[PDB]
Amino acid sequence: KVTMNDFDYLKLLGKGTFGKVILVREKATGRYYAMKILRKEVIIAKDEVAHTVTESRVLQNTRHPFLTALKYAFQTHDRLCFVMEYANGGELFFHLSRERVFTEERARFYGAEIVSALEYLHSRDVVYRDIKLENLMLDKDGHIKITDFGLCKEGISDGATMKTFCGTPEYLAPEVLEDNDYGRAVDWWGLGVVMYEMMCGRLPFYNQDHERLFELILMEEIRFPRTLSPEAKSLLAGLLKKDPKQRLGGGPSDAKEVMEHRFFLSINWQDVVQKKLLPPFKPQVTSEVDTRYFDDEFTAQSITITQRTHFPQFDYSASIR
């Protein structure tokens, strides 16, 4: 059984209200990983056990170049630990915040890798439900790594539906802001928002009041910069179609609609998945412990330490299963 003191703890990469994520060195190999450490007490109190269990179980079987690979999943008496591959390039949120906007070409490169990963997940009857800039990360080479599978749902094929009101406010598809159930098209809306941000340099809809924000998502027309290309406008219009049945990717072919769209005219999708494409930006990391593409807000912080209490789908190892 794997435990806490099997790792060195180096720097805080991100912090949440459930727990924290830390850069660690595996003592027995000397290799570097990211570790997400959640507190069981907070999870149980929020009744978010199924979701946290889902996150591990989905990671235990998924394999794709643009999904973060899980090395270990273990637990202590009061903590849950995910140990995954360290994305040296940091969050896409960090980069877009620093650069303000990406070119259509650069956005096309990232979008193609997100689409490839979404096709894969949807083919496995998995709906990701939380596509956003914070959950898209770059590895050392500059390829996309989707992270955070805490709001995944399984067993969702064709027009299967879901009932949990969850996601991230600013990224919620309009149908999720209605009563009753919604389908897997919400992921393609999610893509739409990140595509929109990458090319237009802001969220398509925003207000710090959620009541105001949810009204915008349901009621407001998206606007485009004039200089944006027609196929860029067409893609964003299609992905951000308020009606999921008319939305690009919302049909029975799922990812094929998005893949065949004219915005991706110059993309070979087999080249994408095989990593034959060259990242436009390459992280300039000078060592394994280099955390330049993470925020000082987190990395400057020092690292303190704040019966059958067992979670029944954890204790995983990539070497064993």
Binding site: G16, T17, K46, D47, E48, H51, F93, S97, R100, D130, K132, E134, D148, G150, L151, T164, F165, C166, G167, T168, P169, E170, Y171, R202, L203, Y206
Partner: peptide, 10 residues
């Protein structure tokens, strides 16, 4: 640059 968003459930 927008502020950090936070995920939620039910």
């Amino acid at each position: 640059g927008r502020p950090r968003t936070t995920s939620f459930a039910e």
